[PDB]
Structures are given as C-alpha cells and as structure tokens.
Write a protein that binds this ligand. Structure first.
Ligand SMILES: O=C(O)c1ccc(Nc2ncc(F)c(Nc3ccccc3Cl)n2)cc1
Length: 265
C-alpha cells in the first residue's frame, strides 16, 4: 500500500525497552519476513523536544546502506506513536556477548574494530558523525557481523540493573563532556574506548562517581592491565588523545599493524 500500518505486522517479544519506548520482534504479515519494530511515543518525544530532530534523522538513516550498519527499512506513525521498521539482528547486543565472555580476544576485537571503522568511514563520507557506538548500541548480524544500531534513543534487553546510567560518560570525549564543539574526531575517541573495553571487559575511565570518571577522561588517566598486547596499547593510546587533531584518521586505524595482524577482515 506504499504506506505501512501496525496491522501489516505480527508482533513478537519486546527486544529491548527504552524510555521513549520498545523495539519488538516482528514479521510483515504476507512475506512473513522478520524485522524489528521500534516504537516511539512522541509523548516522550514532545517532552524532550526532539521531533523535527528525529524527523530529519529518519531521512538520513534510510539512505544509509552498509553491511555493518543496521538498516532502516521504512517508517510510519499512527497518532500517538512512531514506528521505525528496522533490520533485524539475530544475534543481539555485543554488550550481552561481552558480558557473557567477560572479555574478547585480539582476533575478535580487531575484526569488530575494522568493521566499526568502515561503518564510520561510510558515515563520515555521508556527512554523519558522532554515532553512539557503546556496546549496548551494537548488534550482531546474521552470522558474525557487527552492526551499529544507534539512532532511536537507546533501548535495553532485560539484564543487570547496576548501571541504568551509571553507564554514561565512559564513551564521551573530553570535548563533548566539556561542552565544546566537536569534529568527526569524536568517533575516534569512542573506538579507543570500545577497543579497551573489548580487551579489558571494563572501559578505561570507569569509576564509581561521575566526577571521578570525568576526572580521568579529561586528564586522560587510564592504565592497561598486564596482559594487553603492546600493539593494542599502541592503537588505543594513539586513539585516546585529549587533542582531537592528534587522533588518527579512520584509515590509519585500518592500516595499523595490530589491526591488520589479528583481524579477519
Ligand atoms: O535477545 C535479545 O536480547 C536480542 C536479540 C536480537 C536483537 N536484534 C535487534 N535487531 C534490531 C534492533 F533494532 C534491535 N534493537 C535493540 C534491542 C535491545 C537492545 C539494543 C538494541 Cl539496538 N535489536 C535484540 C535483542
């Protein structure tokens, strides 16, 4: 019908639940194709005053096409709700996985990293920066792959409680936290932080007070545990630099010896 409706879909379990709403497992009635339906209340959108914000985000995310980015299939609204028709990721969140194994290895890590890197490079070229790449916003595709979800503000599968947030600043760069204008180089900060968590299992700036965390970020105080390969340290260290300018371009990352060394990709 050119325009979809709730009735065109069967609804499964909720995949995660957000503050604006939930993503449900779903399948289009006819083809029986399986997808993900993000539901957004717009009561909650009104409040936080992002609408025309969101309205231009759907515009871009539709035109985006990459293997490592979760695809936006289509969208509609009814009255009280907006509905994102999302590509479905079978394997769930890299956060779950990482929690399960408690840490990843260099082969796994390097590959995820190269994947993320192409993704952003893609985004960058499309004039999109600052994609929120913390683990809980990353999903795992059909077989092995890593997909950036991001977009519709975060949702959570039932799990811990610990952090609701509590989880926050760890992936934010000094410029961003400090309330200054930021270039495409923020997303390199993040890679640095993701990498670290991948090997360590915790992020580099984790602390038990927001202040102490903020302290370590800005002053860039982070230490590796004994086991981290020096080649790892190299990249990470190169990646977390208080100075945005001093942080690599995305290809330098894909060039990096340790990247190319342990990557499958
Ligand atoms: O079993 C689980 O917990 C599970 C399994 C597969 C999933 N795949 C998926 N595909 C498309 C999405 F937009 C999506 N949203 C989502 C849900 C919870 C947490 C984070 C995200 Cl990005 N999630 C999501 C969750």
């Amino acid at each position: 019908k050119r325009q979809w409706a709730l009735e065109d879909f069967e609804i499964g379990r909720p995949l995660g639940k957000g503050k604006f709403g939930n993503v449900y497992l779903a399948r289009e009635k006819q083809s029986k194709f399986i997808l993900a339906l993000k539901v957004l209340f717009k009561a909650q959108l009104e409040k936080a005053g992002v609408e025309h914000q969101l309205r231009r985000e759907v515009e871009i995310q539709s035109h985006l096409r990459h293997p490592n980015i979760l695809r936006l299939y289509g969208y509609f609204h009814d009255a009280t709700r907006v509905y994102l028709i999302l590509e479905y990721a079978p394997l769930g969140t890299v956060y779950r996985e990482l929690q399960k194994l408690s840490k990843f290895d260099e082969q796994r890590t390097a590959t995820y990293i190269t994947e993320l890197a192409n993704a952003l490079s893609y985004c960058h070229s499309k004039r999109v920066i600052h994609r929120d790449i913390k683990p809980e916003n990353l999903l795992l595709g059909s077989a092995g792959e890593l997909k950036i979800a991001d977009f519709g503000w975060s949702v959570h599968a039932p799990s811990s409680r610990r952090d609701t947030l509590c989880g926050t600043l760890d992936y934010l760069p000094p410029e961003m936290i400090e309330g200054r204008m930021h270039d495409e180089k923020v997303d390199l900060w993040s890679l640095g932080v993701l990498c670290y968590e991948f090997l360590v299992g915790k992020p580099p700036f984790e602390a038990n007070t927001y202040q102490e965390t903020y302290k370590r970020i800005s002053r860039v105080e982070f230490t590796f545990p004994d086991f981290v390969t020096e080649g790892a340290r190299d990249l990470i260290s190169r990646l977390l630099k208080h100075n945005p300018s001093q942080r690599p371009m995305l290809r330098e990352v894909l060039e990096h010896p340790w990247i190319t060394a342990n990557s499958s990709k």
